[PDB]
Structure formats: C-alpha cells, structure tokens
C-alpha cells in the first residue's frame, strides 16, 4: 500500500563450489548491512537457484533508482565486494526495473 | 523462511504494453486473494526496455508454486495474453537464503 | 562419435505456430533425404513458450553443417518464415563426446 | 512425442576431462538401466573448451523425473559437486511429430 | 581504463527492418555529428538474424554516456521506433583496456 | 566492400587471472593488427562491474578474413596463453555494419 514505483534490481552471481558458502554469508552481509543502515534501501533477498549449487540471485529494492546509485556508493556494497573479490564471477544484472503499481 | 521464488520474463508488443500490465496485475492480484501458499506477487517493468516485463512470485515451497500454476487465475491470465505475448521464460526458480 | 551438433531457436507469433512446425518439418525432411553429411534433425517445442521453437541438427563433421547451410532446404526454409520468425539464434555449435 | 532436456554445464579448465568421463558415465549408465531414457549424449562446445551441454531424450517427461531421483543421476552430481558450474537447462520440450 | 563502450540488441518485425536500420543510422549520425563525447556509433545488423541489431557504442566516459542519453537525437530515436522496436537490451558497458 | 564484419566474444577469468587475461587479449589484439591485412579493429574491453569478465571487440574486412583470423598463429597462441584458467569464447554476435 501506498509504495509508489520502487526500483527492482536483480543480480547473478556464480561462485566456485567451495565457496557456497562464503558467499551465502557475504550476501546477507550485504542484505543486512544495507537494510539496517539504508532507508532507501527497502528489501534485499539472497536467492539459491534450486538446481544450479554455484549460482545465487540477489533481489533488491529501492524507494526510487537514487537510493539504488545511493547503496552502490555506501559503505556496506564496498565490504561486499572485498569479501567476494576473491572468487566472486559477477554482478551480471538481469534487470532494472519499476513495479507497476496496482 | 526458506521461501520458493520464480521470476518470469515477458515480452509484448507495444501496442500491448497497457494490456499486458493489466493482465500481470489481475494475476498477482487474483493470485494473493486465491492462493495461501502464494505470498508476493509482482511486476516489473524493466527500467529501458517498455515491451518487457517481470514477474516476481514468492511461494510457500515448491508444492505452492505447483498448485499456482494448476489453478484458475493464472489459467485465465494466459487466455487474456496467449494472443499477443511471448513467454514465459522462466529466469530462475530457487529458495532464500535464511538469515 | 565427434559429429557435429547445432542447436537453434526460433520465435514465431502466436497464429504462426502450426506454420514453423510445418517449415521445420520441411527442413528436416528435406535435409535429411537428400544431404548425406546431414544426420539427425529434430523440431522441439518449448514445454512452457508456446512460441519457442528449436532446431536439434548432428552432421558429420563442421564442413557438412556449412554445407547445409548452402544448400536449398534451408533457404527454402527461410523463405517460408521471413514474414514473422524470429530467428536463428544459435544456442551451441559442437561436438559429440565419445564413449 | 519424445520429450527432449538440453542442459548446459561449465567446468574449471583442469576439471575437462573429469566432467566429460561423468557426463559419459551418466550416458551410459542412464541407458543401460532406465527404460524411460531413450538418448543421452555428451557435448563439447566447439570452441569454448570449458563449456559442455547434455542432451538427452526420454519417453515422457515421467520418464525424465524418474531419472532425476535415479541413482545414476546422483552418483554423476557426486562426481561433478566439487567443480562444476550449473546444471542451466537451456529447455525442455516435446518434439514435433512428423 | 580509457573509453567507455556500450553495446545494445534490439530486435524488430520483419517489415521494419528497412525502418530500424534508418533509424540507428540517423541516431548514430545525429550523436557523432552533434555529440563531442560520442565517439563512435554503430549499427549492426546479425549475419544470420535479419530481425536483430546491434548498436556499438563509444563515449569519452560515462557521463558523456548519460549526457547522450539526456539528448534529443536519442529522444527522436525512441519516437521513431516506438512502436515496433523491442529494446532496448544492454549487452555490456564498460571500458577499453589500454595497451 | 562496403560492409565490415564484426564479432563480438565474452571471457570469464578466475579473479586472481583478471591481470593476466588483459595481457593476453591486448596480445592477440596488437599480433592480429600488426600481422592481419583483414583485420580492421580490435578492442579489450573490461566490464564496468563485472570485474571477472572480459569482451572482445573485432572487426573485419569479411567474413572470409575472420575465418582466416582463425586459422593464424596469433589467437592460436593466444589460446594457449588462456587454456588453463580462462572461461570462453561466448560469441555475443557476429554481424556486419550498415552504411549510412
């Protein structure tokens, strides 16, 4: 009610069997970090494809596409990213989008 | 919890960009009021492309997302768009990690 | 034994499905009688898009698909669905594994 | 209408010859002991060396989901669970009779 | 690194494929003529998919990037194509490695 | 011939091999242009967020001297500098450029 067009991002990961893991652990790392200290920054879901054990998905959401621009400069995003720099292919991004509102 | 998620891609054409939304949104709509085990039901249009569409759906477990498929609402969202849209192509189905 | 596998996917409209089974039935066929480097060619439907199709091609070596793709059946094929297909898009071109 | 099961599989470039050798084993094992698995068939990307597809073809789609809880099934995924990357199914589908 | 490429898929109806092309050309024209930060700008058409395209884009940096997008050459490339043209669909961004 | 042909190939690298795959697709690229009548340009292109992944920009006289490319010493040893970590080729597309 009343969430006016949020903004949709959703992203890929593909990680090395030995690190399923480290990055299970790392993106919610990610969703915790931005979801306590991001307003903006509205619902972030770390996503197990069900057959494929080295792929992750990472759902998030934004009051707007400026509180999207907003977590990829904050301090949680650049934590993540040295906790995975290591092993991590990826982010590729599926999309970007507006919910329709109805 | 350990939920189920399914996320579905449509394309339209542009003269059933209206038409499309419309018909995702009795979908979600009809869906969260008939379904228990159906918990989130939205769309997404993407952000650049305007003939494309998302579906987020979160279910209970597998067996909710099943019975979705095998139930009316999402029978009469296909007779609505079965003319004109292309789909749907499956992007992931998978469960959320727990923390 | 080391042939050669084509993948191929094609998108149609709606009112075009029973069209493209029929071009790529003739494609098949056609391919299959009368290039003797052609070995194996499969029309599938996607279980889900009903507007997804593909193509399952084994020859016998590289040389025999770039032949196929000289010869008559396949434009004879593309003649048929200019007007509305989407396609090709190649999903992998490779090798068998023996054993 | 044969139903049809294309996946694709990407491997380390050390783990080649290991995923081939478990893909083959799932072939072979596959069609000696389930009915239901009419072809199974291993395959190279032609130049993306650590990149192989399985393309496989059952009698019914029951046929498929019975050789998903298989034992050949599962031994090839102990073969392959410390390297692998997918399965991504790049379809399912019936074929088109004629 | 140095220069900042962008690359776009689209994908038309078989009856404007004469009207896309012209399209990007008058989009690719329009931003190298008018555009100091638009270095390079390409349309591509597949070798075997009459109905894709491909444009290939350079830009100084990024921002030049997004200062294209806020043009009216691009806002004119949208009208034209608005109502059969699927995209767009970013392939990529990024930048060219130096050496 | 007024239309050039262009490929376009995606990489995937482990990430300790980010440094040594740049080195090798600017190798192909400057042995392709340096010793390649037929081939016209050639780019390496890191993605923008994507830090493991990898693009190759060609371009080529005709299909015939991207065939030709392929035959010659420069990518074969290319692929051998990237037989044992990097994962590729993806051909994103080959096409051919409209005039205009």
Redesign the interface.
Known sequence: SGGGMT??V?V?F?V???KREAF??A??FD??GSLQNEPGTLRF?????????????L?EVYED?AAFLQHCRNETIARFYELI????????????????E?
């Open positions: 903004y949709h959703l890929q593909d090395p069997s030995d299970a652990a993106g919610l969703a915790n879901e770390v996503i197990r494809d069900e057959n494929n054990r080295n792929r992750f998905y759902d596409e720099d290591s092993y991590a292919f990826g982010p590729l991004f599926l999309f970007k989008g507006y919910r329709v109805g």
